[PDB]
Amino acid sequence: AWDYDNNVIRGVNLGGWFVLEPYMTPSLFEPFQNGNDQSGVPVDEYHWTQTLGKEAALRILQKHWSTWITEQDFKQISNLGLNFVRIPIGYWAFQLLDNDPYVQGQVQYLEKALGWARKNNIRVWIDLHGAPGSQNGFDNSGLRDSYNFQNGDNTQVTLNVLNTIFKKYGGNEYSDVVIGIELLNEPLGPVLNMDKLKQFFLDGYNSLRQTGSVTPVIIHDAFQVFGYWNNFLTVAEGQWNVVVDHHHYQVFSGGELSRNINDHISVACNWGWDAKKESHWNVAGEWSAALTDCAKWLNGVNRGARYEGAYDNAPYIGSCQPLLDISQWSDEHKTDTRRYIEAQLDAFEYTGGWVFWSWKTENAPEWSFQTLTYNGLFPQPVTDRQFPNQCGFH
Ligand SMILES: O=[N+]([O-])c1ccc(O[C@@H]2O[C@H](CO)[C@@H](O)[C@H](O)[C@H]2F)c([N+](=O)[O-])c1
Numbered sequence: 224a225w226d227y228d229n230n231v232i233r234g235v236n237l238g239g240w241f242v243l244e245p246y247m248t249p250s251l252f253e254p255f256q257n258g259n260d261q262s263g264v265p266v267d268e269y270h271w272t273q274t275l276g277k278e279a280a281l282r283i284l285q286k287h288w289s290t291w292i293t294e295q296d297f298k299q300i301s302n303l304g305l306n307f308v309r310i311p312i313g314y315w316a317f318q319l320l321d322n323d324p325y326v327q328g329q330v331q332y333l334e335k336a337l338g339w340a341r342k343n344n345i346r347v348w349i350d351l352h353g354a355p356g357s358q359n360g361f362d363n364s365g366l367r368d369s370y371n372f373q374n375g376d377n378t379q380v381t382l383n384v385l386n387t388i389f390k391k392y393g394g395n396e397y398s399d400v401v402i403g404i405e406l407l408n409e410p411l412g413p414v415l416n417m418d419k420l421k422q423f424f425l426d427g428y429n430s431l432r433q434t435g436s437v438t439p440v441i442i443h444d445a446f447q448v449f450g451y452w453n454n455f456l457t458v459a460e461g462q463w464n465v466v467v468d469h470h471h472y473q474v475f476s477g478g479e480l481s482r483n484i485n486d487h488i489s490v491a492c493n494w495g496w497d498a499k500k501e502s503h504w505n506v507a508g509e510w511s512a513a514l515t516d517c518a519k520w521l522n523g524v525n526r527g528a529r530y531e532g533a534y535d536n537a538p539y540i541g542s543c544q545p546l547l548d549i550s551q552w553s554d555e556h557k558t559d560t561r562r563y564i565e566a567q568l569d570a571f572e573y574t575g576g577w578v579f580w581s582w583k584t585e586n587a588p589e590w591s592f593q594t595l596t597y598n599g600l601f602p603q604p605v606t607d608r609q610f611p612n613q614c615g616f617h
Pocket residue numbers: 361363409412413445446470472475476521522
């Protein structure tokens with residue numbers, strides 16, 4: 224259904240839909256604020272569902288699931304010249320741990336989305352975005368500040384969830400739509416046992432192929448250096464249809480934030496050069512237009528922005544308030560953003576393509592493909608260049 228040698232992925236993530244993220248849908252979290260006090264705001268989906276209870280959580284989420292993304296979005300995506308979506312989903316859509324606060328129902332909408340994809344000639348990855356115990360401690364795993372995916376029976380439960388996903392979506396029924404199943408979003412390499420993570424990836428690869436599925440297996444790079452995965456799941460060992468997912472940002476440290484625009488572009492270009500050297504097919508499955516970490520709650524509920532020296536002992540660089548509304552942006556900031564987007568697009572099209580995070584947000588413009596396109600900052604058509612050939616690829 225896809226030719227990873229000859230085709231380029233031009234896609235968007237459908238984030239904030241089946242896994243809640245406070246910075247993406249702040250309207251669902253803000254009712255818990257007490258004036259300016261954020262101390263009682265639930266920090267993740269786990270705590271949000273727990274605080275509301277099962278009945279209120281399901282009422283509110285059904286409304287969200289039914290309106291956040293609809294068939295109309297899929298038509299707009301196709302109209303904009305995109306060919307692909309990545310769909311994050313948590314483990315709790317399929318299986319609950321004993322005493323999990325989560326509610327279910329996401330699968331009905333996942334299956335509607337697969338039909339909407341088919342109808343609009345859009346291909347899909349399904350991405351297991353949160354594992355039991357958390358694989359990274361990020362709020363977008365479902366459970367912040369916990370790192371227990373490799374503890375207890377949590378890895379085994381994750382494999383059971385993947386087998387369900389494999390039997391449902393890795394078979395003949397969706398072979399014209401599903402071009403990859405991503406085993407686990409962003410396992411936090413530095414705090415995990417890498418040998419056990421490799422064993423988990425291998426078990427997932429083998430279990431899918433044992434079902435008779437030919438669907439590509441997508442592995443996230445676990446924040447390892449370029450080339451780390453070259454010798455893993457290789458054709459020499461009869462392992463095939465494997466894609467590496469690299470994610471790229473320049474906003475989650477003080478050092479990255481303090482770079483001038485020219486150095487931001489140099490780093491983006493180098494992502495392209497380095498990915499070209501790798502031995503697996505590879506796709507940039509997550510990236511954005513952000514040059515700041517100013518979006519409210521990007522770093523988590525009740526955490527501030529490094530950009531204005533309010534988090535992670537970062538020095539003050541600039542005030543976030545002026546950057547929260549795209550209509551208040553300076554001419555210089557608009558230009559820098561367009562340059563940065565174009566450099567990233569050229570770098571990512573130099574290998575398998577790109578998947579922008581995300582299609583939409585309530586009010587965070589750096590992270591919304593819609594908002595950027597409508598304001599002329601994301602190229603439309605996506606091949607248009609105001610700053611051609613910044614990287615000099617050959
Ligand atoms: O050490 N690391 O491998 C690593 C990984 C992700 C890191 O950054 C993480 O990036 C994610 C996007 O990939 C964000 O969702 C998280 O909020 C952020 F903590 C950082 N960090 O905080 O600078 C370090």
